[PDB]
Amino acid sequence: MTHSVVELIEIESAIIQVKMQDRTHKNAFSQELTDDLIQAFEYIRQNPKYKAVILTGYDNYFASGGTQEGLLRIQQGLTKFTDDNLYSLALDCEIPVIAAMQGHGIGGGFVMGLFADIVILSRESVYTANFMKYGFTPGMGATFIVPKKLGFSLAQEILLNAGSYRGADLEKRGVPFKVLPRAEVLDYAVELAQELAEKPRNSLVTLKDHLVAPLRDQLPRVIEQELMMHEATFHHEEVKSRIKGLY
Amino acid sequence: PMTHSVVELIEIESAIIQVKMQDRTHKNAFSQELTDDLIQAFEYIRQNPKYKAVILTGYDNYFASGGTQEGLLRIQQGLTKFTDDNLYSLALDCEIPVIAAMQGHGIGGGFVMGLFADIVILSRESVYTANFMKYGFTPGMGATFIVPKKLGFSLAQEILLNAGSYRGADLEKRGVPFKVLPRAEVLDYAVELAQELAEKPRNSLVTLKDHLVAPLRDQLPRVIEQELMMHEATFH
Amino acid sequence: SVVELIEIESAIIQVKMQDRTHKNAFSQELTDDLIQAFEYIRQNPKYKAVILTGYDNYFASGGTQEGLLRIQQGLTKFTDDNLYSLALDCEIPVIAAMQGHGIGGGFVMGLFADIVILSRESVYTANFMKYGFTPGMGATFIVPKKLGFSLAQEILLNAGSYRGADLEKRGVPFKVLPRAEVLDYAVELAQELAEKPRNSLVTLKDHLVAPLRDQLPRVIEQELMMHEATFHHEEVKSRIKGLYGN
C-alpha cells in the first residue's frame, strides 16, 4: 500500500490476500495501518474480479486494536471510534472475506476480524474484547458482532468482563469458528479461498448480500447506541488512568 | 407403503409413526415418486391424530439426497426453472414433533428437509452438505433461513457460501447442537426419544410446538420469495 | 430466613439459597426471601456483581408440589410472584453459580443471569412438560436465548434430565466444572467484574439485555396463553401427584 504496512498479494487469479504488517505497532490501528487498510479494501472494491479475500496478520499478531494514543484521544473527546471506520471493512466488502487470525486479536483488532464471513482462530493466540478493562464500554460494533458470531451467552461474559482467551479456550467453550495451530491457519484460509473461488463471483456476491443484509441493516443503530455509551463512560478521568496504567 | 412404494409407514407403537424413505433407485433424491409418497405420508399423519411423534429417516447409508442430477442439469441448462415445492417444509408444517433421524447422507434439499425437523440426529460417518452453490446456484428450499436458525449464523455462512461436504463427525467437532451418533445407533436413539415425547399429552406437544416454531412458520415465506429472487438475479 | 447474604471482598454480594427443608424448591419462605434479597441489592449501590448459588448438592428445585397443584387448580399462576426474572431485572451483572441441581423453574431462574456456571455432576431439566403442561417462567424465551434454538426444542418439548457433563458435551456456551470448583470460579469471575467501574457495568448490561427486557413481557403473555390451554386438565393434577421428585 502507501505506508507499506499492508501487503496485497493476488494468490490466484480470483483470491486476494490482505496482510497487515505494521511491525512497529504490532498491528494496532496506527494512522498508517488505518489508511493502508482502507486503501486495500477500496482497491478490492475497484477491481471486481476477486471471489474471496483473506485478511491476515504477520508472525504472532492478527490485529491489536486501538493504539494507546488513539484511545487517549477518544478519552479526551478529540476523536470518536467512528472517525475512521475499520470495524466494518469486511462486512462492507461485496465478496466473502476470511479473517485468518493466525496471531493475537485484541479489542478493535478482534472485532474487525469478527465481521468477516469466515473467521479462523489460532489455538495458541490470545483473543479479547478488552474495552471494559480500560473502564469504557465496547465500541467498534463489538456489542452487535460478538453476540451475532459467538452467541448471546458467551458474548455477555466476553464483553462485560473483557477477559483474555486463548483460541484453545474459545474452542473448548464451543465457538463455531475453526481453531488450528497458528502454523496451519493461513494455509487452511488459502484452501478455503480456493474452494470459494470455484463458484461464480456473481453467485457469491448475490448470496453474501442476502446473508449479511440483516447485519448491514442493523449495525448503524448499534453504532449510535455504542457512541451514546461512550458519551456516558469514556470521558472519565479514571479511563485515562487505566489506559495509561494497563495498556 | 405409500402409492409408489418408496416411502414406508411403520407404527412404532400407538403414538409413534416412522416415515421411512426408501427410493433406492434414486438414493432418496427427490424423484417424482418420493415427492408424491412423502407428501402422501405427511397428509396421512395430519389426517390421523393418534400420533404424538414422527421419525423421518432414510434407508442404509442415505437419509435424503435432494434434487435429482437430471433435475439440476435441466435448470443449469435453461430447460426448466427452480420452482417452489412442498417438500422442504414437511416437518415444520407437521402438527406434532418430528425427529429427523439422519442415519445416512443428507445432501442439498435433503439436508435442508431434515433441518426443518424439531429434533435432528446425525450419523458420524455420513456426509452432510448444503451443496447448492456447487451447481452455481444460490441456495433454495429455505436453506438460507433454516441453516442459520439450526446451526447458527457463523457456521451457516461457511456451509451456504462454500457448499462443502461435512462428515457428521466434522460437524460434531465444530460444535453443533444436534446429537451425533454412529449410524448403527441413530434410529434406536430416535425411537427412544420418540417414546419419551409420547409420554406427554398430545395437546401439550402441539400447543408447545406451535409456539416454538411460530417465528419459523411466520418468517419462512418471505425468505423463500427472497431465495427465488436470487435465482432470477443469477440467470440472464 | 432461608437466603443468606454474604459480602465478598468490597463489592461482590453472594445470595445463597439455603432452604434445606425444601431442597431450594420455591417455598413461600424462599420466594419471599429471594425477592427481598434482590430488593436489598437494588437499594445498595455499592455492589458490582451478584453470585446467586444454592447449598451442598442443590442450586434450585423449582415449584414445590403444592405450588404446582395451586396453578393446576387455577388459584395462582406462575406470574404471581415473579422469581423468574430476578437476575434479568437486577441492574448489575449476576452469576448463577449452579453448583447443584437446577430443576424446572429453578433452572430457568438461573438462565436469566448474565453468566451461568454448571456443575458436571449435577442434573438440569426444564421439566414442565413431564407434568403435562407447557413451560412457563419465561423458559420458552430464555432457554433458546441462552442455549440456542435447536437444543431448546429438545429441552422444552421433552422435559429430559441432563447432567452438567451431558450439556457440556452437547456444546453449551456455559462453563461446566466439578461441583467443588463452581463457587470458587464464580468468585474469581466476580472479582474480575468488580475491577470495572460500576457505571460501566450497569450501562453495558442495560444495553446487552435491553432486547430481553423488551421482549420478555410478550412471551410471558404467550406462555400464560399456553398455560390456559394446558395446565388445567385432570391428568396434569395426576402427574404432579404421581411424578413429583422421581
Numbering used by the authors:
A (entry chain B): 1 to 247
B (entry chain A): 0 to 235
C (entry chain C): 4 to 249
Excerpt from the publication:
In this study we present a structural and functional description of the bacillaene synthase β-branching enzymes PksH and PksI. These biocatalysts are responsible for the final two steps in β-methyl branch incorporation in this PKS/NRPS pathway. There is a single active site per PksI monomer, with each active site positioned on the periphery of the trimer, ~ 43 Å from one other. Akin to PksH, PksI adopts a characteristic CS fold, with a ββα core, that comprises two approximately perpendicular -sheets surrounded by -helices.
Of the four PksI mutants investigated only PksI-H230A was found to be catalytically compromised, with barely detectable activity for 3-methyl glutaconyl-SNAC and significantly impaired activity for 3-methyl glutaconyl-CoA. Surprisingly, PksI-K80A and PksI-K232A both display catalytic activities akin to that of WT-PksI, with no evidence of functional impairment. In tandem with kinetic assays, the crystal structures of PksI-K80A, PksI-K232A and H230A were determined. The active sites of each of these enzymes displays the ground state “closed” conformation as observed in the WT enzyme, with no evidence of significant structural perturbations within the active site. These data thus imply that the observed kinetic effects are not attributable to global or local structural reorganization within the enzyme as a consequence of the amino acid substitutions made. We thus propose a His230 dependent mechanism wherein this residue has a dual function both catalyzing decarboxylation and to act as a proton donor to the decarboxylated intermediate 7 to give the reaction product.
